[PDB]
Every structure is written in structure tokens, then in C-alpha cells.
Ligand binder design. Sequence first.
Ligand SMILES: C=CC1=C(C)/C(=C/c2[nH]c(/C=C3N=C(/C=C4\NC(=O)C(C)=C4C=C)C(C)=C\3CCC(=O)O)c(CCC(=O)O)c2C)NC1=O
Ligand SMILES: *[C@@H]1O[C@H](CO)[C@@H](O[C@@H]2O[C@H](CO)[C@@H](O)[C@H](O)[C@H]2NC(C)=O)[C@H](O)[C@H]1NC(C)=O
Ligand SMILES: CCCCC/C=C/C/C=C/CCCCCCCC(=O)O
Ligand SMILES: CCCCC/C=C/C/C=C/CCCCCCCC(=O)O
Ligand SMILES: *[C@@H]1O[C@H](CO)[C@@H](O)[C@H](O)[C@H]1NC(C)=O
Ligand SMILES: *[C@@H]1O[C@H](CO)[C@@H](O)[C@H](O)[C@H]1NC(C)=O
Ligand SMILES: *[C@@H]1O[C@H](CO)[C@@H](O)[C@H](O)[C@H]1NC(C)=O
Ligand SMILES: *[C@@H]1O[C@H](CO)[C@@H](O)[C@H](O)[C@H]1NC(C)=O
Ligand SMILES: *[C@@H]1O[C@H](CO)[C@@H](O)[C@H](O)[C@H]1NC(C)=O
Ligand SMILES: *[C@@H]1O[C@H](CO)[C@@H](O)[C@H](O)[C@H]1NC(C)=O
Ligand SMILES: *[C@@H]1O[C@H](CO)[C@@H](O)[C@H](O)[C@H]1NC(C)=O
Lengths: 233, 247, 50, 49
Amino acid sequence: TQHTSSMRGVYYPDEIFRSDTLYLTQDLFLPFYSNVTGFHNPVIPFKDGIYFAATEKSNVVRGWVFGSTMNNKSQSVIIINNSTNVVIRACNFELCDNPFFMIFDNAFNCTFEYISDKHLREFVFKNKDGFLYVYKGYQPIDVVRDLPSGFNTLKPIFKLPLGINITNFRAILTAAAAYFVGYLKPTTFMLKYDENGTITDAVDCSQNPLAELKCSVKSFEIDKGIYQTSNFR
Amino acid sequence: VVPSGDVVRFPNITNLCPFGEVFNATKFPSVYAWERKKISNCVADYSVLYNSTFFSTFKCYGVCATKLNDLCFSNVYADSFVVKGDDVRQIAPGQTGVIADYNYKLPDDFMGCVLAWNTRNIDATSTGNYNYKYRYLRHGKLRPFERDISNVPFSPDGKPCTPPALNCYWPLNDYGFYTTTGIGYQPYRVVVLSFELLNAPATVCGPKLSTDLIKNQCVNFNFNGLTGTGVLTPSSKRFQPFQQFGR
Amino acid sequence: YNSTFFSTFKCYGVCATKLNDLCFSNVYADSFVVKGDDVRQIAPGQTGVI
Amino acid sequence: LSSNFGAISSVLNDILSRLCKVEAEVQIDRLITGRLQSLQTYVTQQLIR
Ligand SMILES: C=CC1=C(C)/C(=C/c2[nH]c(/C=C3N=C(/C=C4\NC(=O)C(C)=C4C=C)C(C)=C\3CCC(=O)O)c(CCC(=O)O)c2C)NC1=O
Ligand SMILES: *[C@@H]1O[C@H](CO)[C@@H](O[C@@H]2O[C@H](CO)[C@@H](O)[C@H](O)[C@H]2NC(C)=O)[C@H](O)[C@H]1NC(C)=O
Ligand SMILES: CCCCC/C=C/C/C=C/CCCCCCCC(=O)O
Ligand SMILES: CCCCC/C=C/C/C=C/CCCCCCCC(=O)O
Ligand SMILES: *[C@@H]1O[C@H](CO)[C@@H](O)[C@H](O)[C@H]1NC(C)=O
Ligand SMILES: *[C@@H]1O[C@H](CO)[C@@H](O)[C@H](O)[C@H]1NC(C)=O
Ligand SMILES: *[C@@H]1O[C@H](CO)[C@@H](O)[C@H](O)[C@H]1NC(C)=O
Ligand SMILES: *[C@@H]1O[C@H](CO)[C@@H](O)[C@H](O)[C@H]1NC(C)=O
Ligand SMILES: *[C@@H]1O[C@H](CO)[C@@H](O)[C@H](O)[C@H]1NC(C)=O
Ligand SMILES: *[C@@H]1O[C@H](CO)[C@@H](O)[C@H](O)[C@H]1NC(C)=O
Ligand SMILES: *[C@@H]1O[C@H](CO)[C@@H](O)[C@H](O)[C@H]1NC(C)=O
């Protein structure tokens, strides 16, 4: 089935402590009111970065695997969280047909190792310049069978220095919960920064003529009358 | 008024950076399987290298070489590999060749330094050192700072094939290093240092002495390499954690 | 890439990475032989015997 | 004042902290020209008003 991502998937694309400001940019973002694909395990493609949302209560999903061919002929990265710790490991795994919460047969020829010590989880994964950026946010949701309406910014948790293509990825399940995937597109957004350095409001300049007017005037409040706008269509 | 004073403040770091561990190792990887190492929490003096190591090539992009002592870096990565003599000119932005296409690619907007030195006494043997390889066949170019260590057989048609066939080739070639060849066929060790400036708390920094604070006077300050001129007053503003300065 | 290795390769007026998607009009090739220290004189704005 | 006008940065003290004189003057002159022409635009509008 297909759902709608209403004003979701907004992250920090930079790092400067900024007071009351508005910033207009074009970047890989999630378009407003765009389609997402829901699953209540296929090899989902990784085009230009993804937004991953997990509605769960018993924590049945455990990390991800990212790779090119899902074989032992190419590097793949595994980011999972077992009962005590969260581990990231980039190796040539024998990727099994059906993984469990043991995922790999052997591991060889590999470099990157890292060990670190109802409700909704949102993640943004973006691979660029040999780095994998991961942004994370949390939501205390009630019972629902859809991605809720709202707006929540995503904190940058960590970037990984691992130099591989990522064309496919696969979630890892334990064998009640659902997960939704959305693709990032190069679009024009405008963001507002408050007096504490956080993102409080945003708008997409390609969705509505009213939003295009807001992006052209570069303000959230507009007055009565007729104005001329730019081409963010 | 002309300013009369100077304030220098730097992090309290006393360790020396592992110059001996990086520049003087037992063996280096091949260029197609280059190695990346994170460097943090030290002082980049590089004055101890003046009697030990001499670099044929040392060139810096995005900064000046004479400004490296009063500057304070944020996130440093060191990339190490071995090429031959005539490939050292391909380790630069906007370059083409076998190394720049299929083995190691630099971004166009690159901030960092490239430094390479000749090692014929250790990486070359009389009978031949056929240990370092490079890739010379690949479907397409490489994105910056990415590697491909696969060793599948290659065929121009675009389909898998068993390499006792006629149009199937092994994509890797061995560097033949001897002690009786020219200067363009001698081993060179290359280290590429990549860093970013003025984002985060600075963890690897420079060998400058700190100075006591001076208050309420137009003096030239220096906070982690952020030079300026103004008067210093106490503050009541609150910051986000791990954020250095605000504008 | 498996036969000939160039000590010197430098391009003026274009970028070396743009040579694959570009399409040229009239190409002339000039060939000669010099010694090692004269290769730096094959450049615009140079002086020397060559 | 926050425009970089094609230079590497809009902060005048960061161009002088990581560049040499010949390469720093080239970057500073772009900022000088941009701010001069901005201030000229202001004074022309003030004259008309
Ligand atoms: C492998 C990827 C992964 C990452 C990168 C991750 C980040 C992460 N999640 C945290 C909370 C946490 N996150 C989880 C569990 C999960 N979080 C999930 O995204 C999923 C699918 C589960 C289910 C297993 C738990 C158990 C905690 C501790 C606090 C809590 O009980 O929620 C914390 C600690 C926050 C704090 O203590 O202040 C981090 C760093 N968690 C992960 O699992
Ligand atoms: C990452 O992997 C993908 C898939 O393996 C690579 O895409 C291939 O590119 C070649 C180049 O012509 C094509 O012939 C193949 O058909 C592509 N594969 C697919 C499945 O479409 C991609 O090139 C790899 N990344 C890099 C940087 O090389
Ligand atoms: C002789 C035919 C001329 C065709 C017109 C020229 C088009 C541009 C191509 C020039 C050839 C460059 C070869 C050097 C780059 C590969 C060698 C290397 O660095 O590894
Ligand atoms: C020692 C007297 C100095 C006189 C003042 C200098 C004037 C300028 C002339 C400099 C001499 C350049 C010689 C190198 C060029 C010819 C050699 C070559 O490239 O083939
Ligand atoms: C997804 O997009 C298609 C257009 O390709 C549209 O017809 C469909 O209604 C969208 N899905 C939803 C749930 O609106
Ligand atoms: C890779 O996987 C194949 C089977 O798909 C296996 O035969 C081969 O031994 C594996 N490689 C290694 C190094 O174990
Ligand atoms: C989780 O996996 C890591 C990876 O080796 C391991 O060190 C750790 O003991 C595991 N913890 C549990 C509870 O299985
Ligand atoms: C990969 O493993 C093979 C054997 O499985 C080995 O011959 C080769 O050297 C290894 N390559 C790297 C880059 O580790
Ligand atoms: C944000 O900034 C305002 C004004 O500077 C301040 O009063 C407030 O304490 C800060 N923090 C939060 C969480 O609002
Ligand atoms: C520098 O290296 C030489 C090499 O023999 C050594 O003799 C000398 O003591 C070194 N300098 C210092 C200050 O240790
Ligand atoms: C490249 O040259 C080497 C030289 O021996 C040769 O063996 C190899 O087959 C050549 N590559 C191709 C694809 O023909």
C-alpha cells in the first residue's frame, strides 16, 4: 500500500549555531505530501538517500544492511543494535536469504569496526563524498495505522567514513510493527531558526503557489494584495 | 586608538601526533585498497621530521603552508597508499589517468595536504617486488573518496565470464619494482591529510603558547585560530553544548 | 592505461576530466624529441633555447 | 554584510587566518568591491527619496 508523508523528514543540513534566521536552500530533501511505501523482506533500492520510519512497540526491527550487490563480492555495512550494544561493521558478509535479529556466515577482508555502549522512530540516511550521514528522531505516538501528520526535526547522530557505493538496503527483522520508506529528491526548502539554535518551521517551495509566494517574499507572514513570484515549480 | 595587547587561548593538549606511526610503518597498502585512519587529540608540530623524513612532494590546498602553526583543525583523516614515481602527479584535484579514474579520486573542493616521499631502499628488491597492484579496468569512473576492492573478472560486453575465455581479463596489474630502473619506476609512499576548519571543538591543534586573559581593552585575540580585534567582556549568554562561537 | 605511461601530461584551455563528454573540431598533433630538462620549456610564456 | 560576493567566506578575519598575502588580497578585494557598490546603491536611493 501507499501512504502520504505530511510535512515529515526535515533534518539539519549544516552545523553553525544560528539565532533568529530564515535560510533558503536547495538540497536532497523529502517533498511534502509525497508518497511513501509502507510495509506492515525485499531489497529496497537506495537511490539518493532515504527516510525510514518505524512504528513499533516491541522493537522487532534491528538495524539495517546497506550494500551494492548483497553478495560476498562487494563491501556491505551492517548497523544493528543487539540487547546490550549498538554495532557498525563494514565487511564482505555472506548475506543470507532471510536474516534474523548469525546474519553473516563469515566476515573477511574488512576495515571499519565500531562498538558503542506504541512509539515512532525516524531516520535519514544520506551517502555522499565517501561518508554515510545518519540522522535520528523519536516520536511518542498513539495507536494508528498510518504515518501521523506533524513536523519533527531530526538530530544528526553520526557520520561514518566508509567509502562504498550503496545502491540497495534491507531492513533486519526479528523472527505488530510497520515501517515506511520514502525517497529524497533535490528540492528547494526554506527553514526558520529560533533563539536557541533549533529548527521550528519549514516550507517547501514546489508544493503550492502559496508556498512559492512565501519562498519568493522570504517570510511566513504575507499581507493582502497581489505579488509576483519566482519559478520554484 | 591603536590596539596594544595580545590574547592567545588554545586547548590543553600535550600529546604529539603519531608522525612515526603513520610515516614510518612496516608496510603500506596498495593504491586500489588505500587505508584511512582518523587522527585526533594531539599537537601537529612536524618539526621532529626535519632530521628524519624528507618529502619529494608536499602541496597544500585550501590553506597556506606557513599558516599551519597558528591554526587549529577540527577533524583530520589520513589516507595512505603506495604508487610509482610517475603517478604522484595524479594525486591532485582535477586530474585524469589510471589512478585518478579507477583507484583514488579527490574532490574538486578539497581542503588538505598531499605529501609523498621516495622509498626505494625498503619497498624495492633486487629480484622484483610484485606485491603492490592497481586496477586498470572498470565500468565507469569513481566518486570522490570511494574505493572498490572487488576482484571479479572483467569483460567489455558487460556480462560475467570465466577467465579462461578470450575476451575476459583480470582487472588488476602488478607494479614491478626493482632497484635497477629509472626514477619514474620507483616506489613512492603517499599520505593525504584531509581536514575541515572552524566547525566543532578542535581536537588536533598547533604548537603555540597560551596567554593570560586581558579584560576591557582593545586587544588582538586568538581563540582556536579565530583572530580578531575588540574588547572582551563577561557574558550571560548560554550556548548549546559543544558549540564554540556564535555570530 | 596498460601500455604507455606519461611523465608529463598537462592541458590548457580545458579540464582533463571533461575530455570524455566533449567533442572536438580540428585536431593537429605535433611530435618531436627533446632531453629531460627541456620538457618544462614546452609551455606558453616560456624562454630558453627550445 | 553577510554575503561573500563570490569569495571563500564573508568573514574578513577568516580569509586572513588561512591564506597568504598574494592570495588573500585577491579574496579581500571582492568583498571590498561588493560592499562599496552596496553602499553606493544606498546613497543613490537616498538622493532620489
Ligand atoms: C542500529 C541502529 C540504532 C541507532 C543508530 C540508535 C541510536 C540510539 N538510540 C538510542 C536510544 C535507544 N534506542 C533503542 C532501540 C532501538 N532504536 C532503533 O532505531 C531500533 C530499531 C531499536 C530496536 C531495537 C533503545 C533500547 C534505546 C535506549 C533507551 C530506550 O529504552 O529506548 C540511543 C541512546 C540515546 C540516549 O541514551 O540518550 C542511541 C545513540 N539505536 C539503534 O537501534
Ligand atoms: C555501485 O554499484 C552499482 C551496481 O552494482 C554500479 O552500477 C553499475 O554501473 C555500471 C557502469 O556502466 C553498469 O554497467 C551497471 O549496469 C550498473 N549496475 C546496475 C545494477 O545498474 C555502480 O557503478 C557502483 N558505484 C560506482 C561508484 O561504481
Ligand atoms: C592521438 C589522437 C588525439 C585525439 C584527440 C585528443 C583528445 C583528448 C585525449 C587526449 C589523450 C590523453 C591521454 C593521456 C591520458 C591517459 C594517460 C594517463 O594519464 O594515464
Ligand atoms: C647574473 C647577472 C644578472 C643580470 C640581471 C638578470 C636579468 C634577467 C636574466 C636572467 C638570466 C636568465 C637565464 C636563464 C634563461 C636562459 C637559460 C635557459 O633557460 O635556457
Ligand atoms: C502515489 O503516486 C501516484 C502517482 O504516480 C498516485 O496516483 C497515487 O495516488 C499516490 N498514492 C497515494 C496514496 O496517494
Ligand atoms: C563467497 O561466496 C561463495 C558462494 O556464494 C563461496 O563459494 C565463496 O567461498 C565465498 N568466498 C569466500 C572468500 O569464502
Ligand atoms: C552484541 O554483538 C556484539 C558484536 O560482537 C558482541 O560483542 C556483544 O557481546 C553482543 N551482545 C549481546 C547481548 O549479544
Ligand atoms: C581479499 O581476500 C582474498 C582471499 O579471500 C585475498 O587474496 C585478497 O588479498 C584480499 N584483498 C584485500 C584487499 O584484503
Ligand atoms: C532560548 O532562548 C531564550 C532567549 O534567549 C531563552 O530565554 C531560553 O531560556 C532559551 N532556551 C529555551 C529552551 O527556550
Ligand atoms: C636528528 O637525527 C639525527 C640522525 O642521526 C640524530 O643524530 C640527531 O640526534 C637527531 N636530532 C635530535 C635533536 O635528536
Ligand atoms: C594490457 O597490457 C598487458 C601487457 O602484458 C597485457 O598482458 C594485457 O592483456 C593488456 N590488457 C588487455 C585488456 O588486453
